[PDB]
Design a protein around this ligand. Structure first.
Ligand SMILES: [Cl-]
Ligand SMILES: [Cl-]
Length: 162
């Protein structure tokens, strides 16, 4: 198991523009296109992202390319974030993947806001962090996914994905 497979499980794969859990236009493996309510706007961002006239549809290869880019950007963003980097550096490899999963879903800004949980993770207070992570909009909106990521931080294994 690894960050790629983990996210591929959590995000799924769709070759046509679709709307995410929040109602935003998305494509591939969780690649957010825009928050704009306009499908046209989405179509435009997609073509810009792919480099061609897609007409709202992409191939598997194309989706995978966006995916590789987004994972890289996600991790690199953590390293560039002063509040996240320390946390991430303190963690073991499995747990790093958990943090990166959160960043991928909610943005660096959103995760940096989990101040108290970050502190607990940094202190390796696993059970405590898990409880605090659950007190959030994130957990209430996407509970199954949130549970998977939380268990990963709690146990340090890939069990929830197994
Ligand atoms: Cl892009
Ligand atoms: Cl969910």
């Amino acid at each position: 198991m690894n960050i790629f497979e983990m996210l591929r499980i959590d995000e799924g794969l769709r070759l046509k523009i679709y709307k995410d859990t929040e109602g935003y236009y998305t494509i591939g493996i969780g690649h957010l296109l825009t928050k704009s309510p306009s499908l046209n706007a989405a179509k435009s961002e997609l073509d810009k992202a792919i480099g061609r006239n897609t007409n709202g549809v992409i191939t598997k290869d194309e989706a995978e390319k966006l995916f590789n880019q987004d994972v890289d950007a996600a991790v690199r963003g953590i390293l560039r974030n002063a509040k996240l980097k320390p946390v991430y550096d303190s963690l073991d490899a499995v747990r790093r993947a958990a943090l990166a999963n959160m960043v991928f879903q909610m943005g660096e800004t959103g995760v940096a806001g989990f101040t108290n949980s970050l502190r607990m993770l940094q202190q390796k207070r696993w059970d405590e962090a898990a409880v605090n992570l659950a007190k959030s909009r994130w957990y209430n909106q996407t509970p199954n996914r949130a549970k998977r990521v939380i268990t990963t931080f709690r146990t340090g294994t890939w069990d929830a994905y197994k």
